[model samples]
Target: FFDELKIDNKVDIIGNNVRGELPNIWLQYGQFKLKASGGDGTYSWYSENTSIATVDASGKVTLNGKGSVVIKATSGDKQTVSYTIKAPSYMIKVDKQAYYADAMSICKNLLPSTQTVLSDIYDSWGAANKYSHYSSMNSITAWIKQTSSEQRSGVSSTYNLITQNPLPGVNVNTPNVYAVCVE
Candidate 1:
């Protein structure tokens, strides 16, 4: 006996805040285990494309490359089931019309599941932008959490938290530095 199950990968996805029983995922070298329920007590796991991903004896799936792979699990009673998973890449976009506060608010409200951080976005975007139209070396001005520019600011309370690129200790309220959002 089995029901529809998925390899839930929406745990910390930045903007994947949609409501679906089991939506596909955006991942990069990401690793997560497959959970099965309403099935026979014992089950074994395997992947159709080991080059793209592989599942261990414990139903653990780990990405090995870029593509879709069928994660198959066989029950002890010989009921076979599978879910195809792929690591979709994401891109970055800046809302130039909105203030840093507003941009932060949008991302925060939209992806309320997790707090958006600059460094994490930067690191992930660095890899994501390679194949997209944004493959280049440039800086986009934006604001950071208070700690980033707290030392050289006017003051913590009244100081605006702007994460200025091309230098350090420079700060502002993000006049041209709009909010950056990834999708």
Candidate 2:
């Protein structure tokens, strides 16, 4: 048992010539610490796509915008490690048919504590990309049934409160649904 344990440990250490915590995807305007182990500790960093992002000599990555790129870290012994960087926060399922309240609930539920549902129309690049399912707040209002409707009574029919606007009308369904996201 002792000999087997020693052999297993040796294999574990040798099998992973170099390893590190590199996330498969990253968000724009974010920072990540580039690192690796198991080779000579010293490492130099570089980016394959500098337009989307850049890496400092000390292995720190600075995300510039939305795009894909490969971040490489070379060790003292010439062992090179590469990781792919993605520039989206994450995808959220959209309830296209949902009322404004339901949609806000869905967005709020999907968001982290640091984020919240947008309660007004925004034309910024990030806001547009994050919530492009609907064209304008007017659409949401038009899609939502009036307060007299039995399914949604007493609720405000106005979607002006929501920052991101969704398409309007009862015909709006799955085809209108979009993968909403945020940074």
Candidate 3:
């Protein structure tokens, strides 16, 4: 055994694009190939849960859904190393098919916890790309978090509930489900 199976050259859009050392957790969906250095410079990879994620023989990991899964790597000598990977929170876009409250319910089922999408995440993704995500669509509506006492008065269905108003380029219209995060 070469003593260690070091995973390197990670390329992902969810966060780090730099190609060196894989991230312990991913907050978005995407695929990336994991390169390893160990005995005989040969390796094999495995994934514990294919439903949530998968690893190809070449160490390519694909985030398929929301959940926790373990990834393992074995050197040519059969020595092994394992890492636990956490997928990002689930997201549900607001559409004609469901109300914002309905979206929230579905998202809660998809992850360990539920809440309105946070503004900080939007800040991280920037506005231009997110705005362009919806072509010719105006005003994205999503539920905002607030105390019952602080709820806003609006149309009958949404009255007394705080819903984030759409920004010029950014829409709070989608309910991005968060797992057991914050409180």
Candidate 4:
């Protein structure tokens, strides 16, 4: 019998364009890194620069021009997965929907971890375009139910407590849910 084993790992990217849907032009500037665990040898990465995006040897893929392209990485021929990058110019805009509000609570329950739900939302909407700008939108929408049902003044007060000062793990979910969204 013949068989091939494939190592697997997930890539996580943090940056303006890499972080949201409806992504901003910041893509031309920011990039993404392909990360893996099972691969111990030197890794090489490549991206199709058909405009959808571009990349460097270290796997710093950036949406340079405009079109659809796939980002791929190979670690000594072990792990491989492609990120289908869609050019902002060609892809139809995703309209802001009301479902976003109910989505979060449902997500929280379904995702097991609150952060996981946040990650899901981030991947869905936050990683498109103008992500940071709409962080408020994402936040408020996620916590609408949590805020109104409690009638605890949780949204505004929590926002004041969090935003005006420094807090640990602000990038985390609970804070984002409370500070930005609930408010």
Best by TM-score: 3
Which tens-of-lDDT digit does each residue in 1-183 have in candidate 4?
Answer: 222323233333543234333342232323455543345455666776645566677655554554667776666646665656655422211222223233344444221122332333344333333332333333232222333433343221111111222222222233333312210
Pick the winner on TM-score between candidates 1 and 3.
3
TM-score of each: 0.40, 0.38, 0.48, 0.35
The runs of at least 3 residues in candidate 4 whose Cα sits more than 4 Å from the true structure, single-residue gaps closed, are 1-26, 89-183
Better candidate number, 1 or 3, judged by lDDT: 1
Evaluate residue 29 in candidate 1 and report its C-alpha lDDT on the 0 to 100 scale.
Answer: 36
Looking at model 3, residue 75 earns an lDDT score of: 81
lDDT of 4 at 100: 29
On lDDT, the candidate that comes out on top is 1
Candidate 3 RMSD to the real structure: 7.9
- Per-residue lDDT of 33 in model 4: 52
lDDT of residue 122 for candidate 1: 35
Q: What is the C-alpha lDDT of each candidate?
A: 0.46, 0.41, 0.45, 0.38
So what's the TM-score on candidate 3? 0.48
TM-score: the better of candidates 1 and 4: 1
Q: Of the candidates numbered 3 and 4, which has the greater TM-score value?
A: 3
Q: Which of candidates 1 and 2 is the stronger one according to TM-score?
A: 1
Candidate 1's residue-wise lDDT over 81-137, tens digit each? 767775545423444534545655766632111224444443332332232223352
Q: Pairing residues by index, what is the TM-score of model 4?
A: 0.35
Worst 10-residue lDDT window, candidate 4: 155-164
